[PDB]
């Protein structure tokens, strides 16, 4: 009713010479905001011997207070590619390792699992073994040395494997047909496949996971977590920044 | 007024079947209408009905019901319309919405309940579709939504995509009695897949 | 025939945020297509196309009595790190930032029931003094009247004034850039009703909508929980 | 979105990411 | 030659939990073989599933782990110029792969087992 | 060889019914098979498989089944192939044919099951849509009924109004074993009215 | 017989509206199943001195669990390049080899073969001596460190040299007028050529085969070989992977 | 077949591997 | 005669090598 200003009249609001742009909102573009490496986990290694596990790369749990938690946790369904730095670090006097020889293998949604020592190098008595799916072949490796290695990481692209067009970050429903607990907010390969860490450290160090998920995709807006305490009544939220009276 | 759940609904046939497929008539899929539950004076804000679509309430569809039954799979959408019932003395507010893989639930999943929603929800509620029903204006809200999902149609039995929330924004407050709330679901471009066997 | 390379004096670092991508490792993987709607390209849209429900008390209204006056009834410091604001989306996406710019919509839907009717002003003022404490001292500022019962809802927009290009989404102990003022709601009149044994206050919702001029900018980690 | 550079192309549009339908 | 029979060769969707008799599996997708019009017949196990694309490698049953349920049944029985000399018959069964048929993401080789 | 029973299918709806009509898609009314019996080396001429379609095996059909359940009446045809197994050291034949209300059956009214014509009878079955099955010749009579009887549509649960016979003309002579019998539904235009309830 | 559905009718079987595409079937592709690094192979060294031997190319023989073991039983005949990697993993303590350089040479199908010391490095007393074919010249020698070597590996692409234009990964015959057992199926230069490592280390270490077969050409498709035990009736095979319930 | 990049061709068609006639 | 890279005149063809009459 009446709008535009001065008049004391009922329905009429003042004037707004609205703003110009800067910027052009860009930040808030969802697949920039992703593009990143993000450190995402922390893990440990596993004995280059053993009947070890592989790990899985679900960036979809959160809880854990970290942008990038919530952010995923803002939509209803996700596609994105990977990418990937591990840096192993070290947990013990770096002088322990003089080699520090380490394999790690990707494994593409839906790929098979048991693995125990098989692929044996030897020579001059000793002889090492290293794990049946830590060997080079289809799912790829790499392998990387931390003697003075000047940045104790290794990196790359992974694509999006799961078989589903879109990941449901949210499900209303159960993977299997025996709707047990566990089987929930679940539905298989929803997520970017797994990866094993394997070497004659495991011990004298862990890991550091990051991740980089380019082309991202965001379908259905969901509720935004706050991340803050509520602050009292008719106040504001002080914080501490790089402005602030000094 | 009409609202739309991200988009009109599209009567395509599954890309992920080579398997035979029927397609289903109005007629078969109808119309249905139940009472969701009677919004009370004492209720305060942060309630809900939730009402995840279908089922639970499938048992009940029956014609469209029937041949879900016997069907491994469906696409379709949803016209709904919640309806509250109550004079021009009462007040309050809801905010009914249909959600995209909703979820809490306390796992009685797929059983229509009832929660009081964590509140960052409630405030962000609006951030999907959904519609106002407020009590000194309109008496009405309804939605149309679309097939939905990670896969190109899914299991009514173990999934449902769309959910409704029926969201207590301003208690009920006025006349001593209750506000009966109330919603028509009707099932917009079903399809099946690979009917199942003889129940013996 | 070899290139004659100088390598770098930062070399072997690091740095998360590199323009450029790693090497891949699995090519030729095409992709199953995706119809799956409301896919959303910019944080912005549905900040602006969405509106979110205030936070007052642990609720997302406020409320007028048949008793009222001049006692401010909705008040706010206009800071994204604001009370009020806490709740909502808007507030909360912008903690993914360092800086804010622009006017924000409030949307007041009075609930209060048909046989009722009530009035306000919702006044602006502008971050300096030491803060109003009645209708007819913010009256002389920025405001508009609201006579539920003409409009069972209404739209006003909390504007941009600052020599500050832009501001902060992480306010504090009050700096320059760190307030652009307070919104105020105030009784007008009170609760007329048919019969003040069943009406006897009424509920006007509060929601906030992005504003058109409105952005965002520079991405931020978060610091421990407070 | 954030891919900028020039050898950002070192690698194929086919083999470095995925490609949808 | 001198013999005869039929059968109802169906597919059952990965549902309930398996039929156990023809008048049970007959409300499906099946056709009817009488061998003496074929001697040999053809039957294609579609792709049915929200699955975009499934399990190579299955396991305690997942959504996309089976996709339903080959079956043949006996709709009739062994007829023979004479039951002293042949009582039965063998039905080879060969499998080639569907023209939709694709695979993907190659893998390596885990403990055999 | 194709037979038509009187003439080939209308796909008209119901002269009768102001009443919403759901058309059957085959993929619902689909494809039916069971064995009728086995002809054995004993029975003397004059005998019979009553199979009046389509109840007693309607509990069977589950899908076309499923809807002409919750649903109050019916129009359609059937598509219906009689299949005998045996060599070619059998003798003897049968008339199977298709019957307009037939009527006998000791009131097991709708109960396929077996019987003895009068006589009179078998020497003119023929005088129905009918096809012989000759085991020095074929093994398959082929038919096809169009919707019949006084209503222009009617209750399948209280009518109907195909029935088959399976007519045994000449014995079966040859080696000691039986020849099983068969048979294969499938209903062609099918047509429903009347939703009824839901089963509480 | 009647084909296209729903009558019950004998021939009749029911409609099939066959799939789209996705993937274009490319990773099946023969030419890229091959053009990847595999663990091939594990191997020892040889002294710098001593009359050594040659090891051969040959990765037809199989037995072993291993992926391109079948694949390439998988063809009757085939055609490839090849390209290596050479790795040398430590059996003692790393701190033993303060050098460690270490020749390679490569040895094309059908080249001449007796070695021994023959090349002789002196300076300062105790003087080195290379092997007579270690030495560098017509065919491809590699020599690399292994002395804080960031990778202790080196790598290279070599071509089809066999005779045969094409190689018979199966032979009913024999290579030889003596038809002897041994001369089964083989026919001579059947195989990529030899390689010969040699160092100061041969002790202190093993090395780590890799074969990558760019261009490959498969001839005449093979029974392909089951890999895994037959499970049991009316069952499936059940197995650990990046689904399953959790 | 799998190779894919630019300097996938840094050596010439004829020196880096084998050639048909 | 074996020079084969692309990079194999990085050098040129005066600085690199000698040259004729
Ligand atoms: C995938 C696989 O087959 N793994 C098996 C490994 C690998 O074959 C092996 O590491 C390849 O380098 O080998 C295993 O079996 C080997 C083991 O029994 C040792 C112990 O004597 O002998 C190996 O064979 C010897 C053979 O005895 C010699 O005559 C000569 O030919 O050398 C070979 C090896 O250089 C067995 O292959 C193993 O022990 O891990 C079994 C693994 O499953
Ligand atoms: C391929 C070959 O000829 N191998 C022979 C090596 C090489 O010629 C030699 O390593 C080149 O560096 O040499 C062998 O014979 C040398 C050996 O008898 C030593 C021991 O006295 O003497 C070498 O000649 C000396 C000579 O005595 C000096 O007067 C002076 O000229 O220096 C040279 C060498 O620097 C012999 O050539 C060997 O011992 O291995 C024989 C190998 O077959």
């Known amino acids: 009713v009446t709008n535009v200003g001065e008049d004391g009249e009922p329905g009429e609001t003042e004037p707004r010479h609205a703003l110009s742009p800067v910027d052009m909102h860009v930040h808030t573009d969802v697949s920039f905001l992703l593009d990143r490496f993000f450190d995402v986990e922390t893990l440990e290694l596993s004995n280059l011997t053993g009947s070890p596990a592989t790990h899985v790369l679900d960036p979809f749990g959160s809880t854990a207070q970290l942008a990038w938690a919530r952010l995923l946790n803002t939509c209803t369904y996700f596609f994105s590619d990977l990418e990937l730095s591990i840096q192993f670090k070290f947990t013990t006097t770096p002088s322990s390792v003089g080699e520090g020889f380490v394999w790690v293998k990707w494994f593409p949604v839906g790929a098979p699992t048991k693995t125990t020592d098989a692929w044996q190098l030897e020579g001059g008595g000793n002889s090492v073994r290293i794990q049946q799916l830590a060997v080079a072949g289809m799912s790829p490796t790499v392998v990387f040395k931390i003697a003075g290695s000047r940045s104790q990481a290794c990196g790359f692209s992974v694509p999006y494997t799961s078989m589903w067009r879109v990941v449901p970050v949210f499900y209303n429903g159960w993977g299997a047909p025996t709707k047990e607990k566990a089987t929930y907010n679940w539905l298989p390969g929803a997520h970017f496949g797994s990866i094993l860490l394997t070497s004659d450290a495991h011990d004298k160090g862990g890991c550091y996971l990051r991740y980089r998920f380019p082309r991202a995709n965001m379908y259905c807006p969901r509720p935004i977590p706050p991340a803050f305490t509520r602050p ?13 009276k000094q | 007024g009409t609202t ?17 497929v029927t397609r289903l008539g109005p007629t078969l899929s109808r119309h249905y209408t139940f009472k969701v539950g009677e919004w009370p004076h004492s209720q305060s804000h942060g309630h809900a009905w939730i009402c995840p679509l279908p089922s639970d309430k499938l048992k009940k569809m029956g014609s469209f019901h029937e041949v879900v039954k016997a069907h491994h799979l469906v696409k379709n959408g949803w016209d709904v319309v919640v309806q509250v019932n109550a004079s021009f003395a ?24 009832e929660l009081e929603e964590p509140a960052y929800t409630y405030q962000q509620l609006s951030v999907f579709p959904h519609q106002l029903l407020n009590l000194r204006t309109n008496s009405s809200v309804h939605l149309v939504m679309p097939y939905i999902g990670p896969g190109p149609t899914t299991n009514l039995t ?3 995509p769309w959910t409704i929330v029926i969201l207590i924004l301003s208690e009920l407050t006025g006349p001593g009695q209750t506000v ?15 009917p199942l066997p003889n129940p013996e | 025939a070899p290139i004659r390379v100088v390598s770098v004096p930062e070399s072997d670092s690091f740095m998360s945020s590199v323009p450029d991508n790693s090497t891949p490792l699995y090519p030729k993987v095409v992709v199953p297509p995706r119809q799956v709607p409301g896919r959303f390209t910019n944080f912005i849209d549905v900040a602006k196309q969405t509106y979110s429900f205030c936070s007052i008390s642990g609720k997302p ?55 009722t009717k009530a009035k306000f002003l919702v006044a602006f003022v502008p971050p300096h003094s030491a803060a109003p404490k009645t209708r007819d001292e913010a009256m002389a500022c920025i405001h508009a009247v609201w006579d539920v019962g003409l409009n069972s809802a209404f739209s006003f927009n909390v ?25 105020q709601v105030y009784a007008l009149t009170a609760l007329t009703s048919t019969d003040i044994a069943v009406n006897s206050k009424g509920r006007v919702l509060v929601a906030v909508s992005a504003g058109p001029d409105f952005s965002l900018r520079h991405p931020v980690d978060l610091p421990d929980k407070q | 979105g954030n891919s900028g550079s020039i050898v950002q192309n070192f690698y194929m549009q086919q083999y470095q990411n995925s490609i949808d339908a």
Chains 1, 7 share one sequence.
Request: hydrophobic share 40%; net charge negative; aromatic share 14%.
């Open chain 1, 232 to 244: 009292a009544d008719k106040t504001r939220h002080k914080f501490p920044t790089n402005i602030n």
């Open chain 2, 4 to 20: 739309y759940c991200y988009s009109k609904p599209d009567g395509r046939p599954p890309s992920t079947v080579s398997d035979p």
């Open chain 2, 90 to 113: 009462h007040s309050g507010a809801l905010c009914v919405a249909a959600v995209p893989e909703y979820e809490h639930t306390h796992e009685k999943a797929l059983k229509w309940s």
């Open chain 2, 158 to 160: 173990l999934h449902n």
């Open chain 2, 180 to 194: 009966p709330v109330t919603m028509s679901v009707a099932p917009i471009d079903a399809m099946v897949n690979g």
């Open chain 3, 61 to 115: 209204y406020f409320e007028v009595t048949n008793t009222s006056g001049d006692e401010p009834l909705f008040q706010m410091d206009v800071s994204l790190s604001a009370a009020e604001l806490h709740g909502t989306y808007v507030a909360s996406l912008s903690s993914f930032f360092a800086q804010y710019r622009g006017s924000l919509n409030f949307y007041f839907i009075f609930t209060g029931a048909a046989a």
């Open chain 3, 159 to 183: 504007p941009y004034s600052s020599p500050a290009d832009f501001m902060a989404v992480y306010s504090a102990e009050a700096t320059v850039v760190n307030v652009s003022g307070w919104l």
